[PDB]
Amino acid sequence: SIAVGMIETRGFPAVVEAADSMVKAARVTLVGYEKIGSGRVTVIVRGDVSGVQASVSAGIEAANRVNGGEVLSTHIIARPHENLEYVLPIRYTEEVEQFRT
Amino acid sequence: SIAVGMIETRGFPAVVEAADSMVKAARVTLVGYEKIGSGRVTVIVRGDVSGVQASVSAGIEAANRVNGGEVLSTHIIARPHENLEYVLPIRYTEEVEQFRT
Amino acid sequence: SIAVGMIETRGFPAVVEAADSMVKAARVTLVGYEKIGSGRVTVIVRGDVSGVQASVSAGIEAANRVNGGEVLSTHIIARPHENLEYVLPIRYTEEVEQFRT
Amino acid sequence: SIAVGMIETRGFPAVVEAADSMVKAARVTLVGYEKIGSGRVTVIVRGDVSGVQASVSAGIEAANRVNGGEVLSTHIIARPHENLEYVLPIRYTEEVEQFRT
Amino acid sequence: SIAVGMIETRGFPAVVEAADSMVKAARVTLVGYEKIGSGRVTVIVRGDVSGVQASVSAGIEAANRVNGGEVLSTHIIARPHENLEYVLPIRYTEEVEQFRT
Amino acid sequence: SIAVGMIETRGFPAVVEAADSMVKAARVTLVGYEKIGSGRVTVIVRGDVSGVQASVSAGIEAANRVNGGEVLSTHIIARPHENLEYVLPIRYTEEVEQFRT
């Protein structure tokens, strides 16, 4: 359940820049982006605890510097419980895509 | 119809942390997360009444401590009526997934 | 066109408790739950006029007592017009489910 | 292109009551209900100009009397242009339903 | 890429009246209506520059006269770039409908 | 991962004009438009860094001049990480469209 790092934000252009940062600032895998509605959107990454940290870190600074960047919330569980992974979009995609479509 | 515990929240990062808590603080199964729109999202678990309690409890404290955590609503029916289970997302998933896709 | 009873609410956990009430407080069948967007969600039941009443009644008290329960709107047509039933989600589901999927 | 009558409203319970009225107050056919998002929902009927009137009239009074009824907008084109009918949900449904599903 | 004329509006009944106008006031084809969420909805038409003008014109006056008409935004590109047409809903529908369904 | 340029905006008519600009002001390919909810919508283009710049530039001026144009956010990654491309809508569409439908 390698640490999970996510960061919410108001606006899409700022969420992309946050995602580009996290994935660059550390050895973290961008797992997905979640839309809660009301201009709110989270970006989730996975990797070690200090990896997931270093990236959630940068991500936030880069997001805010955006022409409208508004980091709404931020969090990271180090060793997030497993059951959690089969209920939330903290995991991988692409795979069962052929079946969905 | 083992007790049902859910907790709403504004923002996704705070709903995940709420879910990670509930599922850890007790013997409860995270059944799913519901999106009502407008930054609002609920997390639902299942287990005994005191199990579902102990977890909805912790969940709320952990959510609020989040960098933007905003617990919107909270509830738990101890012995929630059956018909209710076949109309609301209080149950299990994964199973008929192959057919949907 | 047996009377129709519904109750809107802000938040999902409060809408479930409202539904658990109505369906218990009287001989009413929970037909479905509607999402209008913006944290708003209605619960609809069917039964006699006094049955659909007694339940929409309880439902409201139980919803409000919820940790965030916010009953938004409430209504009941006693003998609601038929055409209405084939345009709104006031009816039954499950049946043409195999075809949809 | 028999006149078209519709009425928007905040909340679902109030839109249903609006629909139950229009379809009763006149010889109008409830064609459908549209969701624009943000608690907003329209109800559309069809019939003569004075029929579509008499019903959009009542509809509004009945909606407002609802425990949360909030008529947002209201309109009626008497002889609404045809092209319009093949781009907006002002028409009939049910028919190509078997193919969709 | 014959000029494109669109007009946003708060509420559905006002967007329909806007659409009924544009399509009548000129030789323009109502291509579609877009929902951005939050009671906001645009209506798009196509035709010459002066045709698409004359209609976006009327449309706005007719929309505002509606019992709740609220024209939110308005625009028209005369010779809108092609790539744009294969990314936005400025074009025609109906055609690949059988496949979608 | 040729530079990515996007610009958010409140309202749809202003997002279209922004897109019409970017795609004209430079050698950039409009990849798509994203809806975050709450009247917010982004437009994304791809091309060189200075190409993607020159266009995100114009786009913003043209959007603001719109009858309701409200540029919400703005950004551009020059060499945006690859993983990012398989999680966000920064890429191409049309292709697997036949399968989706």
Side-chain angles (χ1 to χ4, degrees):
Chain A
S1 73
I2 61 169
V4 54
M6 61 200 124
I7 161 182
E8 183 165 48
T9 196
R10 213 141 226 163
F12 180 72
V15 84
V16 178
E17 174 46 48
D20 199 55
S21 300
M22 309 170 78
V23 79
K24 291 182 181 183
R27 287 273 206 56
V28 302
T29 294
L30 175 61
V31 307
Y33 103 97
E34 195 58 46
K35 308 161 72 169
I36 322 81
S38 171
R40 323 192 62 158
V41 297
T42 317
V43 154
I44 323 174
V45 295
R46 297 307 282 271
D48 298 76
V49 43
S50 54
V52 162
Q53 249 155 40
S55 62
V56 171
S57 299
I60 300 176
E61 255 198 57
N64 280 307
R65 266 201 271 293
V66 180
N67 306 281
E70 247 317 290
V71 181
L72 292 178
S73 52
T74 279
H75 211 69
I76 303 181
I77 301 65
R79 294 304 154 200
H81 193 313
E82 302 173 312
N83 178 156
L84 191 70
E85 308 186 62
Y86 62 82
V87 193
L88 296 183
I90 33 172
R91 61 221 153 180
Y92 312 127
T93 318
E94 296 87 29
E95 304 187 346
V96 289
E97 227 48 47
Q98 292 179 5
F99 207 63
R100 191 232 280 240
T101 330
Chain B
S1 74
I2 61 170
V4 54
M6 61 201 127
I7 162 180
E8 182 165 51
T9 197
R10 212 139 226 163
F12 182 70
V15 84
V16 178
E17 173 46 47
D20 200 55
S21 301
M22 309 170 76
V23 78
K24 291 182 180 183
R27 289 274 206 56
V28 302
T29 294
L30 173 60
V31 307
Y33 104 97
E34 195 59 46
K35 305 162 74 170
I36 323 80
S38 171
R40 323 192 62 158
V41 297
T42 317
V43 154
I44 323 173
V45 294
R46 297 306 283 271
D48 297 76
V49 43
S50 54
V52 163
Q53 250 154 38
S55 61
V56 170
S57 300
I60 300 175
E61 255 198 58
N64 281 308
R65 267 201 270 293
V66 180
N67 306 282
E70 245 318 288
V71 180
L72 292 178
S73 55
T74 278
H75 211 68
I76 306 182
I77 300 67
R79 293 304 154 201
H81 193 315
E82 302 173 312
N83 177 159
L84 191 67
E85 307 186 61
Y86 63 79
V87 191
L88 295 183
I90 33 172
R91 62 219 152 181
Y92 312 126
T93 320
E94 296 87 29
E95 304 187 346
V96 289
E97 227 48 47
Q98 293 178 5
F99 206 63
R100 191 233 279 241
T101 331
Chain C
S1 74
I2 61 168
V4 53
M6 62 199 124
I7 162 180
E8 183 166 49
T9 196
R10 213 141 224 162
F12 181 71
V15 84
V16 178
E17 173 45 48
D20 200 56
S21 300
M22 310 169 77
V23 78
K24 291 182 180 183
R27 288 274 206 56
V28 303
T29 294
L30 174 61
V31 307
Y33 104 96
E34 196 58 46
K35 306 161 73 170
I36 322 82
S38 169
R40 323 193 60 160
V41 297
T42 317
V43 155
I44 322 172
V45 294
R46 298 306 283 269
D48 299 75
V49 43
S50 56
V52 163
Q53 251 152 38
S55 63
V56 170
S57 303
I60 300 176
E61 255 199 58
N64 280 306
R65 268 202 269 294
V66 179
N67 307 280
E70 246 318 288
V71 181
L72 292 178
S73 54
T74 280
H75 213 67
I76 304 182
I77 302 67
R79 292 306 152 200
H81 194 314
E82 302 172 313
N83 178 156
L84 192 68
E85 308 187 63
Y86 62 80
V87 192
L88 295 184
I90 33 174
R91 61 221 152 178
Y92 312 127
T93 320
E94 296 86 29
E95 304 187 346
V96 289
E97 228 47 49
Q98 292 179 5
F99 206 64
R100 191 232 279 241
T101 329
Chain D
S1 74
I2 61 169
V4 53
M6 62 200 125
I7 160 180
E8 182 165 49
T9 197
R10 213 140 226 163
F12 181 70
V15 83
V16 178
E17 173 45 50
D20 199 54
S21 302
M22 309 168 80
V23 78
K24 292 182 180 184
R27 287 275 206 56
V28 301
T29 294
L30 174 60
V31 307
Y33 103 97
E34 196 58 46
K35 305 163 72 168
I36 322 83
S38 168
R40 322 192 63 159
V41 297
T42 317
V43 154
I44 322 174
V45 295
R46 296 307 282 271
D48 298 75
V49 43
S50 55
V52 163
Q53 249 154 40
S55 63
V56 171
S57 303
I60 300 176
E61 256 199 57
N64 280 307
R65 267 200 269 292
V66 180
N67 305 283
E70 245 318 287
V71 180
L72 292 178
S73 53
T74 279
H75 212 66
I76 305 183
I77 301 67
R79 293 305 153 201
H81 193 315
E82 302 173 312
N83 177 159
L84 191 68
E85 307 186 61
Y86 63 78
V87 193
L88 296 183
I90 32 173
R91 62 220 152 180
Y92 311 127
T93 319
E94 296 86 29
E95 304 188 345
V96 289
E97 227 48 47
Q98 292 179 3
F99 206 63
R100 192 232 280 240
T101 330
Chain E
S1 74
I2 61 169
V4 53
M6 62 200 124
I7 163 182
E8 183 165 49
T9 196
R10 212 141 226 163
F12 182 71
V15 84
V16 179
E17 173 45 49
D20 200 55
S21 303
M22 309 168 75
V23 79
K24 292 181 181 186
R27 287 275 206 57
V28 302
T29 294
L30 174 60
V31 308
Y33 103 96
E34 196 57 46
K35 307 162 72 169
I36 322 82
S38 171
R40 323 193 61 158
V41 297
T42 318
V43 153
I44 322 173
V45 295
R46 298 306 283 269
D48 298 76
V49 43
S50 56
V52 164
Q53 252 153 37
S55 64
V56 170
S57 300
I60 299 175
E61 256 198 58
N64 281 307
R65 267 201 269 293
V66 180
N67 308 282
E70 247 318 289
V71 180
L72 292 177
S73 52
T74 278
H75 212 67
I76 303 181
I77 300 67
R79 293 305 154 200
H81 193 314
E82 302 173 311
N83 178 157
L84 192 67
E85 307 185 62
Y86 62 81
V87 191
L88 296 184
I90 33 172
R91 62 220 151 180
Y92 312 127
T93 320
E94 296 88 29
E95 304 186 346
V96 289
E97 227 48 49
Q98 292 177 4
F99 206 63
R100 191 232 279 240
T101 329
Chain F
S1 74
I2 59 169
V4 54
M6 61 199 126
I7 162 181
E8 183 164 50
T9 195
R10 213 140 226 165
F12 181 72
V15 84
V16 180
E17 173 45 49
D20 199 55
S21 302
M22 309 168 77
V23 78
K24 291 182 182 184
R27 288 274 207 55
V28 302
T29 295
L30 174 60
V31 307
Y33 103 97
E34 195 58 46
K35 305 163 73 169
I36 323 83
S38 170
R40 323 192 62 160
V41 297
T42 317
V43 154
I44 322 173
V45 294
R46 298 305 283 269
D48 298 75
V49 42
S50 55
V52 163
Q53 249 154 40
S55 63
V56 170
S57 301
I60 299 176
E61 256 198 57
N64 280 306
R65 267 200 270 294
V66 179
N67 307 283
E70 246 317 289
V71 181
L72 291 179
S73 55
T74 279
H75 211 67
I76 305 182
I77 302 66
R79 292 304 154 203
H81 193 314
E82 302 173 310
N83 177 160
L84 190 69
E85 306 187 65
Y86 62 79
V87 192
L88 296 184
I90 32 171
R91 61 219 152 180
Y92 311 128
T93 319
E94 296 87 30
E95 304 188 345
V96 289
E97 226 48 47
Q98 293 178 3
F99 205 63
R100 191 232 279 241
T101 330

